[PDB]
């Protein structure tokens, strides 16, 4: 048979997707990573070219990949929102040939991975054939799904990393936008008693640094020169030896963030020596990985393009499903 | 089908209109922008050629586009005034072919966008077929409306600008004749708590500069040479190095106006860094855009022909409605 | 006839009500002021005595006045929520005699005061007879409404104050929890061009002072002694001459808040001398009235129990309606 | 009607139950609290009197309430185990009269409270009539269920406490045997981003103190006099001023446990001042409540008989369901 | 702020008319690994404007602010119907970046043997973002690139002053 593996990650505010066919043609990651937003092309507006595509689902020309450079309907949502997003994500990066037979590997929140949702209703959404168009003047693809494989999101990350693992203790430290989530596994099974969430994220980090409700994003006020009123854009790039603004602040905020994270680890997880590895993932990983590595030697690990960690993990299980 | 998109903006003292058919033939903006005044051609007066047209509505030959070069009835009004203006605005720039099928995109004050008005009665005015003539000796057009789309006026401006937007914070700073209005949006939704009006406009600006109740318009007294007793006509064009009249005054008045506007922003809106963009629109935009850009870097943005900002925004939603 | 006047104010998070019958018996203000929350007494829970009453509406024993000392259904809401709240507010403080004939005076947001809502649908809710019980083992009241009178919320405040007014310029400066709203009136008519909102409130104030996301409420951490980690509870009450925490902070935050408010006034409203009076209302009034009075002499005015300002204003129009 | 309220809590290793009928007759708590174990009386063994009862379900005489003083089948389990436990828990403390009509209030893990389980299958188990016997030579009860009400376990605790609550931020700090779980609520809704688990419990506490794998339970070696080789039985009761064993150890272990818990709170939850109350529950509450109260003033609260906290919370919703 | 005595660094200067790459190894310029490309920002905005005139952020004054960009204004047309760049910008810049990095790998060598590539010139602010995504942990930019040289010269002049 001619079957492909599609790996999808319907996360926070972005959807990540990867196929060997798309990866083979496009260099980006790429695959693809697009904001979890969807629009529709109505006559009450003027369509525009992407990075955005038009898809045929139901009646309606759905729009996905653009940010709203091509429509104003992106802000609008339906009940149906997620179901449309799934169809458009499957559509994108799906070119055989006309008939595209696949296996789908994806993940869902650990708390739902067994219930009626993200276990029966999610599988039902994924588990069916469908005809999807690509271009308004093209390109029809007939998609058949030969199998589906869903695991806990944190498992995609663990799988992507090259660690052995059958009888080890590992944790996934995910620095998200709004939260920092720690999921611990022992002998390939999640340990709920040793997992936890801290209700502070990168947004809180940059906020606490900016020392202002606004004014944080790498440009908080546009009427300030590039670099002024950072934070997310730009590090310690003020070559004025007289300035006293962070760098100093950054190391201060991050110092407390790291001390809180590791302190919780030792309370819940246990002796940092009993842990085989702690995978550092999330949007904030690149920001904190360095300091953590100096906090504790030979425990923390990071993967390149942390954003595609889950998908690369899911892809491996989907290859097994394909066999 | 053969359907067109008409975009209308029934604003302060001017009505702006745009159609692809009219834009294709006339170079002006143009489209059209005409004062929100209407007249009628009665036998008690002598009709004259425009830039003004005659329209057949009810019984009565309505007159629109002229300024009163062709009639004295322009000053006169009816209760009915606005309803006639709508019909004449639809009539203008409406040539298929005889049968003109359209979709109408327009806006209304944010405060009415959901009520019984500018949501039910306005839609009812727009939502119908009608036969309109163009010339007294011509030109009949049969107009059918296939749909209507109304949004908050500030939304037309946001849409016209090329910004992404689904999860950003933007404000529209509209320097009107009598008021300066700030409308803030977060994740494509207006935030009333972060919007406000200042009861001073361009008229107040030029007034405060002229330092006289009269005497302001670019010619306040006709018996003064062109440039004397400005303000609206002419900038710092007095090449007499001895003169001490503004330029100095202009920068002084504008200095206080900008300081007041930005001060209110920081009080209500928040840290200027938390704002992704502030679109500068209104008759006064061209006057203040320069100084604002120097006040704060990388935040303020302006579009060319600010007068057609709303209409170009509405046109995009109407293309979507047309689909 | 035996008719009474009921004055109601369905505001932000609290509902204020006043009747001459209730005021005559209870000393509180009192009248009443209760959070805009409603519950229901279901068999899946154990009812408890108030300050809370049970009301019969539809089928269901609605609950109002308690904070959730008597039920857990307070958090729950219906679509229907507001309509039930209206019935319970009318019920409370409504004792003739069995047959209670009234006139209802209330207000609504200025932006809706003329539309299909807060002008037709709100009047329809208020404008009807109804049988309401008071106690589960009592007390039936038959309520007839002989008239209804709705005005803009800011008008209730203006009316309550003792100022003359027919040909004057007045503004209402309302320091709310989340926003600070300024409504200007000239010759008894609201002037939209000279009214505005600042998207910062008392919550922002106390926040900015506390210098922490939590930790603000007069007790941010319960494990701190009364007075530590204020702010809302307690002023400058640290008699330790060594401490450097606010008072200093308070005057600093408030200094900027007042400078921003007055600066916006002078920009939008105009010369502070052209204003006859500025009524200072809202939860924050008591906090800022002192400093404002020193900012500008002979302009600012405050009324006692600012929370009942609107209702005392509405009551006066309802007496006129009663006649 | 003659309906009663049964409140059940099928927790960790114990099942708690409360009825007004049982509470009225027995003084214990009591209600009842029995280990989540079940046995059966087979001819291959000799039955014995309790604190244990015999119940008729299926065919089989189930046994519940004893610890295994009356049988050796307690260790044995079925697939069916939980379903039998539910029937025996309903049976116990269920005496009208012969016909017992009730409403059942219970809770389930927050992570399942909406799924196919602890939302549909659990409700199905609870939601039916059944005939249960009490004694082998008696006592038949016909049980009808008129309604069922399930909430998140942490909600039972919040409800039991006397706090208001509709617009507050509260957390439940549950010191369990194996884990310490923190559930945060804001405006009566759980906030997952601000909830977390630490994989250490009381067992870890006493373990870390005992400084031995065995040897901990209040008697680790029976051949040691009462008090020697504590910990769970007995505090600082060694009146030998020469001894250097804990008390010193206790305060040391608990010092680190409290520092870790509060440190995680400030990281995830936020400023301890933004929290209205933190309810301290679980088997460990009595152990740590004192030190926490000194750690932070005016925030921590405890209820008497923490073991019945959930049930007393569920009972209140069941009274509402009964109405 | 880089150390430098025994490293390989290049300066990628996006000028108005040219884009100049100067490579240093152990604090000495390597002529064999330096080069110029005869296209600048003017060529960039030109190629985007798709017109000889008409480019500067206002090419025709009789067009409303934003129309007939480019240098003034980015993707600020909030009309979802418009099909003019943003799309063009990413297209032109896509080719410009591919050409620059391709020349680097030909002349300079393996991008991994480079310790840092400082991105300077009027165009730096325009391309720094895309380059950073092209290759991780190599490109660096300084604030106010226009004063980069002077702040560098000032440091040697302090040494001369001593």
């Amino acid at each position: 048979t001619n079957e492909y593996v599609m790996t999808l990650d319907a996360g926070k505010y972005e959807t990540k997707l990867i196929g060997k066919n798309k990866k083979g043609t496009t260099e980006d990651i790429k695959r693809v990573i697009f904001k979890t937003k969807i629009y529709n092309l109505e006559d009450g507006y003027i369509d525009i070219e992407g990075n955005s595509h038009k898809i045929e689902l139901d009646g309606k020309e759905y729009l996905i990949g653009e940010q709203g450079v091509e429509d104003s309907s992106e802000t609008s949502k339906t009940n149906l929102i997620h179901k449309l997003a799934a169809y458009t994500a499957i559509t994108q990066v799906l070119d055989s040939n006309k008939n595209n037979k696949v296996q789908l590997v994806l993940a869902c929140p650990l708390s739902v991975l067994r219930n009626a949702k993200a276990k029966e209703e999610y599988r039902d959404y994924i588990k069916g054939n469908g005809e999807i168009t690509v271009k308004v003047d093209d390109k029809e693809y007939s998609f058949e799904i030969t199998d589906i494989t869903i695991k806990a999101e944190g498992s995609g990350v663990l799988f992507l990393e090259q660690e052995n693992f059958k009888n080890k203790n590992v944790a996934v430290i995910d620095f998200g936008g709004l939260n920092m989530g720690f999921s611990l596994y022992r002998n390939c099974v999640v340990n709920p008693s040793e997992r936890f969430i801290e209700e502070h994220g990168v947004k809180d980090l940059i906020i606490r640094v900016g020392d202002a409700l606004t004014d944080l994003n790498n440009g908080n006020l546009i009427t300030n020169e590039q670099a002024e009123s950072a934070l997310n854009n730009g590090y310690m790039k003020k070559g004025g030896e007289i300035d006293t603004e962070s760098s100093t602040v950054i190391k201060k905020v991050k110092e407390k963030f790291l001390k809180d994270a590791i302190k919780l680890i030792e309370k819940r997880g246990f002796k940092l020596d009993q842990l085989d590895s702690l995978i550092f993932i999330g949007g904030t990983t690149q920001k904190l990985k360095e300091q953590i590595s100096k906090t504790y030697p030979n425990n923390s690990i990071i993967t390149n393009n942390s954003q595609w960690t889950t998908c690369e993990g899911l892809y491996k299980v989907a290859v097994a499903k394909y066999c």
Side-chain angles (χ1 to χ4, degrees), chain A:
Chain A
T1 179
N2 176 212
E3 40 137 276
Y4 296 101
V5 167
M6 179 70 71
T7 304
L8 290 171
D9 181 8
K12 298 293 294 181
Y13 291 33
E14 301 183 338
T15 61
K16 287 68 65 173
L17 182 164
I18 67 173
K20 294 295 292 181
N21 290 341
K22 186 63 178 176
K23 295 182 191 193
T25 298
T26 59
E27 296 187 334
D28 268 7
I29 58 180
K30 352 150 158 184
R31 327 166 141 171
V32 63
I33 293 175
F34 297 153
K35 185 172 179 195
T36 59
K37 294 183 76 173
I38 193 172
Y39 58 114
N40 186 52
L41 189 59
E42 59 179 65
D43 191 328
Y45 184 81
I46 63 173
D47 57 37
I48 306 300
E49 54 181 79
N51 186 58
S52 200
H53 296 163
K54 293 182 67 58
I55 179 192
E56 177 291 322
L57 176 182
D58 204 43
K60 160 96 188 170
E61 189 68 5
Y62 302 88
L63 266 190
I64 61 159
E66 72 185 51
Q67 71 180 49
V69 62
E70 169 300 339
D71 188 45
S72 302
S73 176
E74 65 291 348
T75 185
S76 184
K77 62 181 182 63
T78 59
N79 57 15
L80 174 67
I81 183 65
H82 180 276
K83 289 190 288 185
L84 299 169
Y87 290 32
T88 69
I90 291 179
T91 64
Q92 63 182 56
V93 165
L94 186 167
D95 57 29
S96 182
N97 315 101
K98 295 181 63 64
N99 189 298
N100 185 305
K101 298 291 298 178
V102 301
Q103 288 80 5
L104 296 177
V105 63
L106 192 145
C108 59
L110 280 63
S111 61
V112 62
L113 181 161
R114 53 186 185 278
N115 185 49
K117 55 172 189 73
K119 189 62 174 68
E120 74 181 55
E121 292 183 298
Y122 185 80
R123 290 190 180 178
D124 292 345
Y125 292 31
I126 62 180
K127 194 79 183 59
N129 297 117
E131 180 289 328
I132 298 168
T133 188
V134 178
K135 297 182 63 62
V136 62
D137 62 25
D138 296 308
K139 176 178 42 153
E140 62 179 61
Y141 295 94
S142 184
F143 182 84
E144 301 74 12
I145 60 154
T146 60
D147 66 29
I148 63 177
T149 63
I150 304 173
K151 190 59 185 68
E153 61 177 60
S155 182
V157 306
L158 283 175
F159 291 29
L160 184 171
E161 182 286 336
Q162 68 297 347
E163 187 54 24
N164 62 31
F165 184 62
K166 184 62 181 65
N167 291 120
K168 285 196 189 286
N169 187 54
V170 64
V172 179
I173 66 160
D174 186 339
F175 290 104
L178 186 156
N179 293 120
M180 61 180 290
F182 294 32
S183 60
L184 184 158
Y185 285 73
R186 184 180 295 275
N187 302 335
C188 72
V189 65
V190 70
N191 184 304
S193 297
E194 295 181 322
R195 297 183 290 111
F196 62 98
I197 184 62
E198 179 293 330
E199 185 282 331
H200 303 153
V202 63
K203 185 180 64 181
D204 297 276
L205 183 66
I206 64 174
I207 72 176
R208 191 185 299 270
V209 181
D211 177 79
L213 181 163
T214 182
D215 290 353
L216 280 62
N217 298 329
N218 115 334
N220 83 317
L221 298 176
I222 299 181
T223 61
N224 295 339
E225 301 182 333
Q226 296 180 326
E228 298 185 332
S229 282
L231 306 161
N232 185 298
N233 188 274
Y235 294 96
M236 181 186 191
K237 297 181 178 181
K238 294 183 178 181
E241 300 184 334
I242 300 180
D243 300 334
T244 61
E245 301 185 342
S246 48
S247 190
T248 59
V249 177
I250 68 177
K251 291 183 64 65
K252 252 43 276 181
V253 65
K254 183 180 56 175
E255 186 58 18
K256 295 295 295 181
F257 184 84
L258 292 177
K259 291 182 179 179
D260 183 57
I262 64 173
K263 287 177 185 186
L264 276 62
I265 303 301
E266 192 158 78
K267 184 181 64 181
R268 181 180 298 270
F270 305 138
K271 187 64 180 63
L272 295 179
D273 194 328
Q274 68 181 60
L275 300 178
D276 295 324
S277 181
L278 300 178
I279 294 66
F280 294 31
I281 65 169
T284 304
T285 301
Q286 294 182 295
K287 185 179 294 180
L288 274 69
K289 183 64 179 65
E290 295 183 293
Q291 290 291 107
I292 184 81
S293 293
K294 297 296 293 182
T295 300
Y296 268 72
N298 292 339
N299 191 296
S300 303
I301 65 174
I302 183 45
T303 61
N304 294 280
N305 292 116
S306 302
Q307 61 190 154
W308 294 98
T309 62
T310 297
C311 77
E312 302 179 285
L314 294 175
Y315 184 81
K316 295 178 180 177
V317 57
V319 305
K321 298 289 188 174
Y322 180 89
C323 297

